[PDB]
Amino acid sequence: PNFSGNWKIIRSENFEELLKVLGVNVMLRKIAVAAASKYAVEIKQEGDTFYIKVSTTVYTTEINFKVGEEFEEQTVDGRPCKSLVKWESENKMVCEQKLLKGEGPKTSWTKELTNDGELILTMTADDVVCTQVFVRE
Numbered sequence: 001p002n003f004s005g006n007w008k009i010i011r012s013e014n015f016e017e018l019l020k021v022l023g024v025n026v027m028l029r030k031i032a033v034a035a036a037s038k039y040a041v042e043i044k045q046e047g048d049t050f051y052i053k054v055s056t057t058v059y060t061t062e063i064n065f066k067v068g069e070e071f072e073e074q075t076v077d078g079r080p081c082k083s084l085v086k087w088e089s090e091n092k093m094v095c096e097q098k099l100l101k102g103e104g105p106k107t108s109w110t111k112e113l114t115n116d117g118e119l120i121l122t123m124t125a126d127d128v129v130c131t132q133v134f135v136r137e
């Protein structure tokens with residue numbers, strides 16, 4: 001299917017609560033929520049190979065992976081991790097992550113393309129789920 005696109009955020013729920021679990025202190029959580037409104041995701045998908053570029057005003061990061069193949073990235077709060085993406089259905093994928101060093105909350109993310117043309121990202125840390133919704137630019 002067509003995950004490829006230039007996606008811009010329209011809605012972000014529970015992001016602050018996610019950062020709290022991750023041990024980010026309050027003033028930085030607030031500054032981060034503010035930065036999440038100027039926030040875009042660029043995806044290029046060919047088959048089950050994905051290129052994903054996440055950008056805010058002052059920072060940009062690139063993610064490259066093949067579904068079913070372990071790769072290295074970072075958790076939301078910046079800790080390196082080993083990741084593995086699998087399909088859950090036609091238009092939804094799930095990524096499980098394991099810390100490279102040390103211990104912390106169990107994190108993961110999902111991406112889904114809806115019937116109505118939205119991209120839904122969820123990010124989880126333990127019991128807390130952050131949901132973000134994007135539309136094409």
Ligand SMILES: *C/C=C(C)/C=C/C=C(C)/C=C/C1=C(C)CCCC1(C)C
Nearest residue numbers: 032035036039052054056076109111
């Ligand atoms: C597949 C799409 C993914 C894995 C998106 C990941 C997005 C992030 C790790 C976003 C992180 C952000 C912060 C850590 C604070 C500044 C605002 C965000 C939302 C860009």
